[PDB]
């Protein structure tokens, strides 16, 4: 049992690392999403003034 | 926000200037319509005067 509990510990650490990578990549992806939306609506300016 | 500003400007600006610049046409209509009815009514009235 005490071998299996440390297997649980190491796999829990791995899951923690996986969720950390998930959330950081996801946050950077919202970062580039915000950049892309801001840039697209930067040209949506000229589109809409001359519209 | 300054985007939505430019759409709002364009929309309200366009509608209002269309109405005003059409009112220019009804205005010149009034101008020369008064000018024409002037002499028109003038000749009816000076023909009924005798």
UniProtKB/Swiss-Prot annotation, chain B:
Residues spanning the membrane: none
Post-translational modification: Phosphorylated on Tyr residues after EGF stimulation.
Locations listed in the record: Cytoplasm; Nucleus
Comment field on protein domains: MVP 3 mediates interaction with PTEN.
Function comment: Required for normal vault structure. Vaults are multi-subunit structures that may act as scaffolds for proteins involved in signal transduction. Vaults may also play a role in nucleo-cytoplasmic transport. Down-regulates IFNG-mediated STAT1 signaling and subsequent activation of JAK. Down-regulates SRC activity and signaling through MAP kinases.
Subunit structure, interactors included: The vault ribonucleoprotein particle is a huge (400 A x 670 A) cage structure of 12.9 MDa. It consists of a dimer of half-vaults, with each half-vault comprising 39 identical major vault protein (MVP) chains, PARP4 and one or more vault RNAs (vRNAs). Interacts with TEP1. Interacts with PTEN and activated MAPK1. The phosphorylated protein interacts with the SH2 domains of PTPN11 and SRC. Interacts with APEX1. May interact with ZNF540.
This protein's name: Major vault protein
Organism: Rattus norvegicus (Rat)
Lineage summary: Eukaryota, Metazoa, Chordata, Craniata, Vertebrata
Residues of the full protein shown: 711 to 760 of 861
């Amino acid at each position: 049992l005490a071998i299996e509990i440390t297997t649980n510990s190491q796999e829990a650490a791995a899951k923690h690392e996986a969720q950390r990578l998930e959330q950081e990549a996801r946050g950077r992806l919202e970062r580039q999403k915000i950049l892309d939306q801001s840039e697209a609506e930067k040209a949506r300016k000229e589109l809409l003034e001359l519209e | 926000a300054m985007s939505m500003a430019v759409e709002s400007t364009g929309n309200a600006k366009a509608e209002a200037e269309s109405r005003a610049e059409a009112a220019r046409i009804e205005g010149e209509g009034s101008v020369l319509q008064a000018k024409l009815k002037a002499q028109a009514l003038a000749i009816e009235t000076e023909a009924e005067l005798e």
